Design a binder for this molecule. Structure first.
Ligand SMILES: NC(=O)C1=CN([C@@H]2O[C@H](COP(=O)(O)OP(=O)(O)OC[C@H]3O[C@@H](n4cnc5c(N)ncnc54)[C@H](OP(=O)(O)O)[C@@H]3O)[C@@H](O)[C@H]2O)C=CC1
Ligand SMILES: NC(=O)C1=CN([C@@H]2O[C@H](COP(=O)(O)OP(=O)(O)OC[C@H]3O[C@@H](n4cnc5c(N)ncnc54)[C@H](OP(=O)(O)O)[C@@H]3O)[C@@H](O)[C@H]2O)C=CC1
Ligand SMILES: NC(=O)C1=CN([C@@H]2O[C@H](COP(=O)(O)OP(=O)(O)OC[C@H]3O[C@@H](n4cnc5c(N)ncnc54)[C@H](OP(=O)(O)O)[C@@H]3O)[C@@H](O)[C@H]2O)C=CC1
Ligand SMILES: [Mg+2]
Ligand SMILES: [Mg+2]
Ligand SMILES: [Mg+2]
Ligand SMILES: [Mg+2]
Lengths: 120, 434, 430, 434, 159
């Protein structure tokens, strides 16, 4: 019988319970977005989790928004292009978490979000 | 008269509320007569009739056809004028359409299968306090079905021991934990005490994992004053979601709660207790899809939709609950093209004897916009609630990853799960018992 | 069976008992079906409590005479499972989940034994039969009412006009159709105003207390109470609610408001047939009737088979009702002084039915005549007079010792001799 | 008539409220006559009697027997119908049963010894705002009696100096400190000021020790408006417990306070000031057990139960206050089998000249579900309040540890305490003065 | 003085597209604009409460954005939350929640909402310390032509 850890395994929603993704697995998820006609975008933060500082009313949380890395990659057809931006972000902010999100102009909304990099 | 109420050449108006009834006439009652009766008895000689125009207030059967269901059975389509209904009142809609006709002697049995809610009427309802999109944005969750677990045993646990189970389940990977439908306020556990301990559990698990957590706190009560009193304290605690059993509590009360949740930013989880009393039998009652459309109108962010382990019928009302425009498809129980003119959708909740091995199918059938509610599926894990929740969260994400890569969940389901067992001892242990 | 089938369990005076008509799937023994009904309608964390203390249990199973594969399973639920004063929770706990169990082809809740310990946690009827009679100063006869027709399409004023004419002719009440709440053709506040004028005009004219069941059924609890509040301001004696479509949580709140403000509450049972029609599945009306008496109501529609009706009528009106299978009374019911509800008879009845209606229901009832009043060839007032005369003629005859069941028609024919109004009515309704 | 009201063959109904009266008839009054009078005079010729059925509203003496108490004394059992009582009103219960009969000339003296509260009546009362179990869970305290100290001197201290004493006592190991029953609001110390400083003390001691602390803030007042105003501010301060003198304040007011505490999550400590005016004498009045059952019904989480240094009588009403089912046991003052049908229990509070050496006996007699309230027992410690509290906390835990190991507290009490003095200088110093 | 800003014109940006964005995506734009150096972001005049974005949801996400950008930059930030509504009860209900959120400024379209309603809102803002941004939607219907109507200066003095 194993006891589920209480520290060191903080999460980042969808896919964060799987082992660290390889470059190939990461590419596949990006391609999923592209094939689905969704727009990929990178976000980064030095704080990786939600908290409540300014309010505690229903539905209000701080730490949900992260910072946008450049802009949504509209018209992207090459998943490796996203990887390139991911690498640049990691170089500019090695001590920051970086996640990949996706937008749909059809559903007019954010519909994707998965961690892509975590600092040492 | 058959042709006062049976009008086979009538063209429905874009403002009419349409109904599809499965009618079983008594022996000796012609289908045209049965249809006319259904329309007449669910709508409109006395001198007062001369002080108005009865024709503008009568319901009318514009079509009837023998159904493939069984013995002398027919589907009768009835059209009701917009003016018969009180704006924003599901209660009045039900009263007007199913309040009297089911007891008519000339009918051996009757079941309401569907309703075409015109935009002119649906626009008079607030609808879901938030809806699918807003909820995902509020909780910052995307790309996968949500996960939850109902606390067990149902009754008998102290408020604190109840919260303990909540925390362990949530910290393991589930997005929500939940009060059983029967859990309101009782001698063994008063509601305020439960709200206090579940709040501690919600926040402890959230701080530990870094992910937003919630627990459907049941506000169902004996009176509207009590129901609101519970919603108000949840509001004070700042938790994200509350719960209501809309059928046992009722539509008048549910609508009030939905309004409170909208005014206070609370998500509203809806349990369908007692639905089987009404929607089980094919020959008499009201099909769940009608009860589902009614809930979307009255207001709810989540609604229980049953299990997946008939499929087409379930998928049918799932679309009726989530989509903006659903095309007529009788093969899936959709008797009328339904346009919701942007009313938010409701997240369908799948629960009932589901475990890790069902993850591929569930993800496949429902897609991301759903809540997969477990019971023993998580609480029955050999290592406890936290490991059980982890096993379910891992199993789900493994399915999502595989689906996103283009794999066939319906055919590769077992392999996907078996493969995930390799790096997840928790999942492996779960796959050994089930 | 199981942990759930305990055929020698002695029910406790505090247990809520249920009688289920169960139709097992092929291959499912009655014992197993019964245990399942009890298990599915009740119950590592189990180790933190006692499952036996909270389990529902089937203590008796019996077949249904003359039925194929049908049994009556009796289940006992401990008092602690239910929230006090909440019919909503009682329904949720007992019928919230079990009707969908695959092992059962069909399931119907026939009766419920409400223990005094639980019923004492409910206010019950805002007033009840006796208080209503004293408030309205009416004794020795069934009350008379009429539903305004056409249902919808009339203006608030024309609606009130019909009210006045009906009441001045001898009816005690007129009423809003169950579908009449608030609509484009007639908004509720306008209807309340004109109906109020009609109530007081007819009362001043006749000298007898009048009322109109003003429907407060609404989309939200806020609207429902707002309507009851204005009725209160108007000083009228009675309001109404469709308890099943509005719901128990809302009905209970309304019942409390009515008790706090001296308002009588007429309860319509719209949509009941969706649940109580079929013998194989659903919930028998007597269950819905007990639920209303508990939640709160002064009147409740009971329809117009015969023995079954008399059965739930007693369950609605009396203090103590002994078990009687012949009348569908599965459990001895003790209401420990909770007031009774006046049953309302309605549906295709006219003057010629007065003898039978009076004989079957007795004085403590309301006989509601829709077309039986508005259909009179001379109008509402003469129509009301004919019904009032017909009823009093029956009452007089019964009081003298005559047999309404055998002399009914002869009693009506004699009244036609001095009542031109009744004579005209009888000519049309045969 | 003796046999209108004296019905020796009457079988009590499960819904009757039963009473056991200790009756002392005047010379010349037969016991049957006295019993009949007690029943008749505490319940039901005028023509109006003919408009109802007096038999269904009369109380009746179904048994009378000479008692072993003293000179011409008897225990008379009276049965009262359920319909005589207003639901949820202890006030009406008292009025109906003891409102008039005690002044009857034919009785030299009368004392109400017990009452059988049927489930049908008790279920109409909220009862304790929380009860034993909930309290333990809320404060996270298990396995031992709770500890508290009443601040002294009673009156004369400034609000701040009062809070200072609170903090020192609490930081030393006590779970609670408390306002004397006489401390409400006076010239030397207004209530709001006391609440402010005691709140600072509660939180300072809690942060220092890491254990949840509380101070019974007395809300007893001259009016219900003032009483609630005090409860409301305690609620604002977020403290865990308030206090009320239910007998001097009254049942109507106590019930309202109990409801407020339930609606706001506040524990309610109940002091029994003035009880001796009523329950001291064996020949006349009302025994405390009746006042205790009344409090459990009206509502309270703690209730003073006296000291242990007659024992059997105390243990008797202690069970009546905490247990769910108490079997008839006249040797312990229990004249009727009492079933509370899950109404929460009340924690009994022992206070009055108790010190460290009494810990073994107190723990032994009351068990874990109790509050041991000291006075000088802690405030009289040679090194101050903190050391005094520590000595009492150490003494108590030493007793618990020994009891848990199976040792006999009643026989090994002194050795257990002496042994603990070896490693606790604070306890040693306390055992030298007492 | 309240915002601690001196010596320069204030800067703001109206979020685009006008309608169509989800409340969260709307707040995202707010945060990015504010963190870059602008003092305010703003709800388009047409943005009140609609099917695609209900007002309370927008207030919640814009509040998160306001505080995130402020904590990051160290400068006081704000977002004109539009309280313009169909009724005075709704208008105040929106102002009240902004008050609960503790944000510094709200917004109203005084001409389309009307002076009776605007005056009430102005009083609420004074009683609760809220700044009030006023949009002049529909002014051109009245002040465009030189020959007929009312020149904007009259509408300005009125405001
Ligand atoms: N002039 C003409 O053209 C004629 C008119 N009519 C007459 O007009 C009058 C109409 O009023 P009346 O029928 O008394 O009462 P209402 O129409 O006011 O109905 C009262 C109750 O009757 C029951 N009910 C009536 N219709 C049905 C139905 N379709 N299926 C199930 N239950 C039904 C319902 O009982 P619950 O709520 O208990 O289920 C309903 O609440 C009658 O006297 C009728 O004979 C008929 C023939 C001739
Ligand atoms: N350790 C053990 O002894 C074992 C325990 N169990 C397991 O325990 C778990 C219990 O949780 P689970 O079943 O997932 O969910 P729940 O028991 O929480 O039930 C959730 C929903 O399932 C439906 N439901 C369940 N029972 C019935 C019934 N009797 N009739 C009709 N519908 C029913 C209802 O759906 P709706 O509201 O939509 O009508 C209900 O709302 C499962 O995993 C089950 O396999 C079973 C075998 C072994
Ligand atoms: N330093 C010194 O000068 C000394 C001081 N004291 C000590 O000071 C301490 C005082 O606190 P303590 O006595 O524990 O408790 P309190 O004085 O706080 O009294 C608590 C309870 O004791 C009961 N009580 C006390 N006095 C009486 C009385 N006069 N008549 C009836 N009942 C009474 C009451 O019980 P209820 O409400 O249940 O009726 C009262 O509620 C003790 O330890 C005492 O021994 C005494 C000797 C020496
Ligand atoms: Mg459940
Ligand atoms: Mg009707
Ligand atoms: Mg004292
Ligand atoms: Mg603009």
């Amino acid at each position: 019988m194993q006891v589920w850890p209480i520290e060191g395994i903080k999460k980042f929603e969808t896919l964060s319970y799987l082992p660290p993704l390889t470059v190939e697995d990461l590419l596949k998820q990006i391609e999923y977005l592209l094939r689905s006609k969704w727009v990929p975008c990178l976000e980064f933060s030095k704080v990786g989790f939600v908290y409540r500082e300014n309010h505690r009313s229903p539905g209000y949380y701080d730490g949900r928004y992260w910072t946008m890395w450049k802009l949504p990659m509209f018209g992207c057809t090459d998943a490796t292009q996203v990887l390139k931006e991911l690498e640049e972000a990691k170089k500019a902010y090695p001590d920051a978490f970086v996640r990949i999100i996706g937008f749909d102009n059809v559903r007019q909304v954010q519909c994707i979000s998965f961690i892509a990099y975590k600092p040492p | 008269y058959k042709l006062t109420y049976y009008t086979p050449e009538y063209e429905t108006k874009d403002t009419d509320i349409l109904a599809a009834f499965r009618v079983t006439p008594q022996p000796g009652v012609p289908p045209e007569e049965a249809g006319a009766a259904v329309a007449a008895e669910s709508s409109t000689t006395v001198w007062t009739d001369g002080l108005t125009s009865l024709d503008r207030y009568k319901g009318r059967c514009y079509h009837i056809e023998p159904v493939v269901g069984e013995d002398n059975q027919y589907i009768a389509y009835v059209a009701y004028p917009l003016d018969l209904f009180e704006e924003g009142s599901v209660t009045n809609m039900f009263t007007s359409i199913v309040g009297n006709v089911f007891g008519f002697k000339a009918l051996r049995a009757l079941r309401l299968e569907d309703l075409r809610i015109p935009p002119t009427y649906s626009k008079t309802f607030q609808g879901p306090p938030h809806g699918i999109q807003v909820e995902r944005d509020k909780l910052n969750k995307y790309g996968r079905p949500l996960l939850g677990c109902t606390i067990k045993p149902k009754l008998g646990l102290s408020a604190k021991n109840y919260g303990r189970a909540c925390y362990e389940c949530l910290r393991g990977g589930l997005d929500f934990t939940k009060d059983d439908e029967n859990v309101n306020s009782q001698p063994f556990m008063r509601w305020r005490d439960r709200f206090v301990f579940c709040a501690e559990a919600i926040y402890k698990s959230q701080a530990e994992t870094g992910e937003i957590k919630g627990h459907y706190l049941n506000a169902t009560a004996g009176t509207c004053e009590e129901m609101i009193k519970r919603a108000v304290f949840a509001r004070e605690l700042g938790v994200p979601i509350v719960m209501h059993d809309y059928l046992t509590g009722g539509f008048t009360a549910n609508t009030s709660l939905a309004h409170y949740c909208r005014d206070n930013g609370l998500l509203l989880h809806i349990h369908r207790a007692m639905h089987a009393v009404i929607d089980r039998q094919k020959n008499h009652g009201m099909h769940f899809r009608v009860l589902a459309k009614a809930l979307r109108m009255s207001g709810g962010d989540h609604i229980h939709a049953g299990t997946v382990v008939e499929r087409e019928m379930t998928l049918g009302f799932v679309d009726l609950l989530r989509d903006d425009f659903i095309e007529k498809d009788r093969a899936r129980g959709i008797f009328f093209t339904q346009d919701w003119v942007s009313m938010p959708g409701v997240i369908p909740v799948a629960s009932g004897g589901i475990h890790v091995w069902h993850m591929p199918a569930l993800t496949e059938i429902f897609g991301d916009d759903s809540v997969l509610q477990f019971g023993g599926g998580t609480l029955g894990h050999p290592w406890g609630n936290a490991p059980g929740a982890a096993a379910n969260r891992v199993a789900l994400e493994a399915c999502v990853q595989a689906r996103n890569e283009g794999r066939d969940l319906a055919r590769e389901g077992n392999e996907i799960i078996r493969s995930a067992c390799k790096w997840s001892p928790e999942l492996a242990a779960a796959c050994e018992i089930w």
